């Protein structure tokens, strides 16, 4: 249930607006689908993420939380590793990802939008982490909320389960952008076209580094990006770059 | 030396105003002795914690300076292992904490407040780690504050011995809240008693997920996170939560 | 190509002015030469980096751009890791280390500047990470970046590849302070100074601490800290400061 | 280019006994391909793997070296990328896998049987990682061999790229059993029945944790432990061999 | 449940003969009790820790095996909890321990046995890890295993739950020696002797080192021995012995 | 105080016979200029490491134990910090280093032979780790030893101060091999010359990828694996070998 515009920046819209894009087990798998074709496509550079509706997402699955209580802890297992296995599918994605924040992104949602590589957030849009309010613990978000803000503001947010809004969420470095009510979509492609105009190799590889990083000692980290800032030197990019900047002209990578 | 307010929040008072509260080795087990039993008091859901006098806890144990510099290599370490301990219960602590800096706190209170869950200062009240002005080493408290504050944030702190004030201690992630001057605890006692509110059972674990986290990779987080969003799904908790939305009453953990 | 105008507190200046400063093989070793004897001088205690110009670091080494994409892979790694030898170097350095970003800063200078224990910024200086614009990677910054602003920081100013300036360099904590269009060395001078004012064992050792920590659970990291606090209670400069403490005097570390 | 022989215990035979069972982009598809369905089918159990032939892995893929030394940058992490997608599928398989390394197995191989969970070697087969005697590194096999054998040994198998035999690998911690020359598949077959009789839910488990813990503190390890610990005592197959267990009978899991 | 025989190595036996001498929570906090005296006694230097009966622990807990899989998800994971805390506090006695395996340690016992520093076991003993042959997962053993053996040997032993026998359990790794049948108590309390003749300082601290180090990266763990091999030159043993040494005779540590 | 004998294998030979070869602050010095030196010798490939006496480094520096108990904590710190720069050199060398254990190696020296990346030791030879036996700690060797052997080897081994034989070393995985009494030399050159046949990239990458694995987890590991995998294959060592192939002919990297 997505909505997917094709292009350099191609565009994933979660379809099931009146129930406020739940990540139902059957929204998680579409999304990874669009994902997949996504990635596989030569001419999508980078991926804008949005919601379709007055929501990015945060809609409680009524349908979920009547039949979770009482699944059985295989299958609750079972369970738990497809919906990582989105978040991580995001968090991990070889191209740039941008979440466009149109509206409310609660729990789930939340976390979804924050697997993103950047996130543009609508300025009358909310964000929050509800999981303890219920009994339920943000767990899979935890992973990369501790690399997006200080201990503190991770306590704070998951602790409390309030909801942020657009200036607290830049200020705590949940957003990178905050658009004027009315486009966060518009301004998120933006954004995405921006990065897309720099080198598909470099964007990837630096995306590759930014994940194993934050797990290992500074001389094994130096390690691997002295390793990195050799391969990259033989790479086609590499050389369109260099060409096109001794022929002061626009690159083709 | 500290006093206990029992209560669904309950309050420790460090007892030693005049002093100015020192973290010395017997406040060090008097604070113990307390979480200890607080930690067992079904009735308590969170524990606040704050100082009596003008501050929250900065006092040079001139009676300590004196000793220190003579004690065996032996005694040093056996105390730092007592000290750790202190932090390492308190930032380990089973229950939400949080500290209400009513004054100031430097050195060892500085990070006796850092060591706590959530923490919200007197509009008033300075900060500061000054162990390298005089020879010493934040050495206990560095484990907590590189989670806490970007590295550039720790080394001015760390390196210069500064003591920051509220508006700056908030903007770079070191406290939560400023409450007006005059009521630094009413305000810690508020944040306290919201996040009681919430499920118990999905506070602790979010703070046994917090703790473990920084410490490992990618993929192995997902793996512990996803594991927890598993077995959460099996509490009662949630359970109780669950029902309490589906009849539109409020959860009774 | 380095000007060192030795002191308490060292200034070392990048000499190469019209060519902008670029961190040239050659440029890479003569920092490091200099680095070493003010390392070895025990009247330095501290040491500001600036450059000789309108910037500090920013120039495209045409000399080598040229070359790079022709070299051979053992020849690519053996640069890499030479280059990776400075930033590491000054990452490492057991002296306090200020950059004074006296101009533009952008790619290897922005990485050589991130490098310093603190960054002092003029109100009108500029700073990014550009590689991704021409198909590099700036891996090796990658490195401390992680470790200096949130995930979502990384990856904007990574992935944009666009130039910051003061004012949000600070707020986003690549930059300690922000000196008025004008004299960030004499600022950075200053700001040296004050940190030289404190313990040079506990300065060296903070620092040693805030290299490892990051790299290690909570318990490991204790068991670290505590061990140093013990160690650095056996210090001269411990037993020389709580003396001036009881001396109400000045202490001469 | 595999066979498989669907059961309690699956066999998937290395199909191309001339060539000696390369391990070919081709071969590297479909042998996922079958770890895909074989995942998939509910009577499968265990999983052995061996090769048709008079080897299980170890033939020069002539096709392969001719290209390589001409492939571009970017189509060789492409493809490290694949192979590696195989070693981590084979080392990460849900189910138990058990290699029977009827003949040699050399580089590639080699890698391959060692990424397997039990080893049951001919006692004439040999196994070797040659990849430095040509200008090679074993590098996705690194990432395993840590694990399974000391550094001393990793050291000797990687630098001298010699082929040791039954006696010394198993010595070595490389195989775990050496059947008579005729069938190490029977015997492999044996193992892999014998752990499957066991616990389903135990089993995947048990290699979870095996897979995470050699990267973290001792602490972290044990609140993963602990949670698992914990989540286990929920699950049906404990409820199952429980019983069984209390009605003297088998266990039907 | 346990008897004491305080003295230079004091002695610990499990008391519960013909029940096995089960790992019941009962059980477990005796051998905290314990563990904290003889902590506390300056005239132990060494523990030795061994069964009452046929068996050293090994012997199913019926009490426990009927609650166990009726118990509430909170209830089972403060269970865990408990247990883990013993295994830990085994692992991480500050004194040197060492297990005696007169007889059988099976499941817990020998998790139990895993846990001490040393092992000496019974020329006639059994040891194994059967949780998988009912359900349950090895997870707290799992821990200390990965440091223990070689990563084969880990899947082999808790994949099937065999119990291996005095032979191959040394030649594993999982014992340090094999004791002729009948006094592996004996033995093993003259190996305890043995390593208590050496520096009480210089033991904790190999032993405090030895737990961390394999939880982070080479230069980290350098970092951590340079501190060490440092304030261990301070201490009075060390000034002990190097008389002694100077004075040909025996330390008295 | 060392000689060298330059050579493809080159051979280094700790000078101070009567002495016993002490790893003295000076003879530290020595063998590390030599390490310089030889790594920057094009003609070397190779270095054999023994000692000229009947040891190959076991000699109590008396001119030492006299000294160390009345350093100053900074001094005493200062030279840990020299001492580990050698271990580190040695572990880290770019070059393969192969030690030949002709005589006793105890403490100092027992962890020098260690830090060589394979070990030849005379069949009459002893080694040990003796540090407690009079109040040090083996903390630099820790940091290698917990990769070289299991946990239970490594506690024996450092508890109680014993030497071993050449034939439980080489079972515990301490020396690779073991020479007839007589020439540990000539057969760890002849070791050494066989490495050394083997590619110059591939070995000193083989070696970078096992120093930086064990301090990270599976997917990290694997993503630099990967990386390498990629970076080797533009090599002129593998252009060279794989020509060298299809040439039916000898390479000549």
Known sequence: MVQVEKGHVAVVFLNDPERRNPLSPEMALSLLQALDD???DPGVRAVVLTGRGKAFSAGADLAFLERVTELGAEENYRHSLSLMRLFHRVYTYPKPTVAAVNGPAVAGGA????????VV???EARLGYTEVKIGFVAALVSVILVRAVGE???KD????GRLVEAREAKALGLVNRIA???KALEEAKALAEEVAKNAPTSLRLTKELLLALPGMGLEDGFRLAALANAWVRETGDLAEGIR?????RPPRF
Do not use: I, Y
């Open 38 to 40: 996504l990635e596989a």
């Open 111 to 118: 976390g979804l939008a924050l697997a993103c590589d950047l």
């Open 121 to 123: 957030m609508d300025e």
């Open 152 to 154: 503190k503001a991770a």
């Open 157 to 160: 947010l998951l602790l409390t």
């Open 180 to 182: 004027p009510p009315g």
């Open 244 to 248: 096109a900047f001794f022929e002061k």
